[PDB]
């Protein structure tokens, strides 16, 4: 039923536009890529307090609508629309647990949803496109915040349209 | 609509526009004087619906109506399974007088025919990222139950069918949801989903297969 709206009260578009996920608490931090430890390239999604734009995202549904409802399964991804290099998934990766990493690959139905939580929105992962959802929150290690499942400790975002770009 | 052109004004008079604070998000089809049919995924609590439009400005269109609707009945099987049974019936506040700019359409009884060229219409994004000023139209051909399960398993439900993925890259885009696909004068489908981006070479869009839903639509609209 429920439409996701940007910081101006305007519907979040389906892929057409890009938005900054702006932490309500961690205003400073902005999204970025990083290694968790010592693997060959940095695929793990984090909030880095030392980057104050961050890389904005695009939310996609296969449904031919030009807005996003809180009830839609989404793909979240960085980069432009054409591109599938920056597509969020949840991969097991000790020490962090269930982390958000990018692949250059994509399912038709993404595994996430955007739900209201107090001041703004949280991202929620749905194991096996099932009925129960796990909040994405943060793990502080190596001087940044790694996005990962932390049911009940969601990281809350307002969504700022990038029409700066 | 990707790689269509402007529709002939008032040529698709069963077309309904779903707008939200003046901004279109979905289309519907008038299938009875009090009932617009659209995409169950297009659900809102209240609708403002344009009838008899071409440009999306009422005043600039003589014969145009902006009706309101408080009421919609999603198929009881919607999103079970996922993306399936994607249809709902919006009851209008008041029934409305057919004119020449505004007319109901019968829904198809038989199932779509592989190879059949059909017309799709709406106000959703063009090839170039921009929204069209006037209603658009394109011809897409039905593909086969097989090429549609191949392209879309394990989410293909026999309550969908696929069309387009010609060489010339004709398709539905964002904002064309719940608009019509006309085969041989009848309403055969509504705009539902497809791969993203729109207009992938050899990639058809999925359409709610309305031949499945005639007894539910009849039986609902009489009550």
Automatic annotation (TrEMBL), chain A:
SUPFAM superfamilies hit by this protein: STI-like (SSF50386)
Pfam families to which the protein is assigned, alphabetical: Kunitz_legume (PF00197)
Keyword terms, alphabetized: Signal
Molecular function in Gene Ontology: endopeptidase inhibitor activity
CDD domains in alphabetical order: beta-trefoil_STI_BbKI-like
InterPro entries: Kunitz_inhibitor_STI-like_sf, Prot_inh_Kunz-lg
Gene3D superfamilies recorded: 2.80.10.50
Classification via PANTHER family: KUNITZ TRYPSIN INHIBITOR 2 (PTHR33107), KUNITZ TRYPSIN INHIBITOR 5 (PTHR33107:SF5)
Protein name: Kunitz-type inihibitor
UniProt lineage: Eukaryota, Viridiplantae, Streptophyta, Embryophyta, Tracheophyta
TrEMBL record, chain B:
Any one GO BP annotation for this protein: amelogenesis
Keyword Oxidoreductase recorded: no
PROSITE patterns assigned: TRYPSIN_DOM (PS50240), TRYPSIN_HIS (PS00134), TRYPSIN_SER (PS00135)
GO MF annotation terms: metal ion binding; serine-type endopeptidase activity
Protein name as it appears in the record: Kallikrein-4
Cellular compartments annotated: Secreted
Highest taxon in the source lineage: Eukaryota
GO cellular component terms listed in the entry, alphabetical order: extracellular region
Residues of the Peptidase S1 domain: 1-222
Chief place where the protein resides: secreted
UniProt KW Secreted keyword: yes
SMART domains found in the cross-reference section: Tryp_SPc
InterPro entries: Peptidase_S1_PA, Peptidase_S1_PA_chymotrypsin, Peptidase_S1A, Trypsin_dom, TRYPSIN_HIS, TRYPSIN_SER
Gene giving rise to this polypeptide: KLK4
Keywords: Biomineralization, Disulfide bond, Glycoprotein, Hydrolase, Metal-binding, Protease, Secreted, Serine protease, Signal, Zinc, Zymogen
Pfam families cross-referenced by the UniProt entry: Trypsin (PF00089)
Role description: Has a major role in enamel formation. Required during the maturation stage of tooth development for clearance of enamel proteins and normal structural patterning of the crystalline matrix.
């Amino acid at each position: 039923s429920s439409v996701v709206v940007d910081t101006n009260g305007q519907p979040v578009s389906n892929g057409a536009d890009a938005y900054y996920l702006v932490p309500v608490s961690h205003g400073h931090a902005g999204l970025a890529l990083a290694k968790i430890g010592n693997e060959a390239e940095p695929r793990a999604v984090v909030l880095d307090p030392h980057h104050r734009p961050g890389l904005p995202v695009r939310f996609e549904s296969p449904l031919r609508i030009n807005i996003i409802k809180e009830s839609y399964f989404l793909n979240i991804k960085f980069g432009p629309s054409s591109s599938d290099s920056g597509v969020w998934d949840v991969i097991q990766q000790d020490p962090i647990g269930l982390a958000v990493k990018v692949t250059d690959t994509k399912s038709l139905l993404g595994p996430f949803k955007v739900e209201k939580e107090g001041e703004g929105y949280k991202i929620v992962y749905y194991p096996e496109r099932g009925q129960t959802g796990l909040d994405i929150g943060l793990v502080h290690r190596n001087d940044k915040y790694y996005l990962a499942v932390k049911d009940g400790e969601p990281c809350v975002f307002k969504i700022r349209k990038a029409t700066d770009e | 609509i990707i790689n269509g052109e402007d529709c002939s004004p008032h040529s698709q008079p069963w077309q309904a526009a779903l707008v939200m604070e003046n901004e279109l998000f979905c289309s519907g089809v008038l299938v009875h004087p009090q009932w617009v049919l659209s995409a169950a995924h297009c659900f809102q609590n209240s609708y403002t619906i344009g009838l008899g439009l071409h440009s999306l400005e009422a005043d600039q269109e003589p014969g145009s109506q902006m009706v309101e609707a408080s009421l919609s009945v999603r198929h009881p099987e919607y999103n079970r399974p996922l993306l399936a049974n994607d249809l709902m019936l919006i009851k209008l506040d008041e029934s409305v007088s057919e004119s020449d700019t505004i007319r109901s359409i019968s829904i198809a009884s038989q199932c779509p025919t592989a190879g059949n060229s059909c017309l799709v219409s709406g106000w959703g994004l063009l090839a170039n990222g921009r929204m069209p000023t006037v209603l658009q139209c394109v011809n897409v051909s039905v593909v086969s139950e097989e090429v549609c399960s191949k392209l879309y398993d394990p989410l293909y439900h026999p309550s969908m069918f696929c069309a387009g993925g010609g060489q010339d890259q004709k398709d539905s885009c964002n904002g064309d949801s719940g608009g019509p696909l006309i085969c041989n004068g009848y309403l055969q489908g509504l705009v539902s989903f497809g791969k993203a981006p729109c207009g992938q070479v050899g990639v058809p869009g999925v359409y709610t297969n309305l031949c499945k839903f005639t007894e539910w639509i009849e039986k609902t609209v009489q009550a």
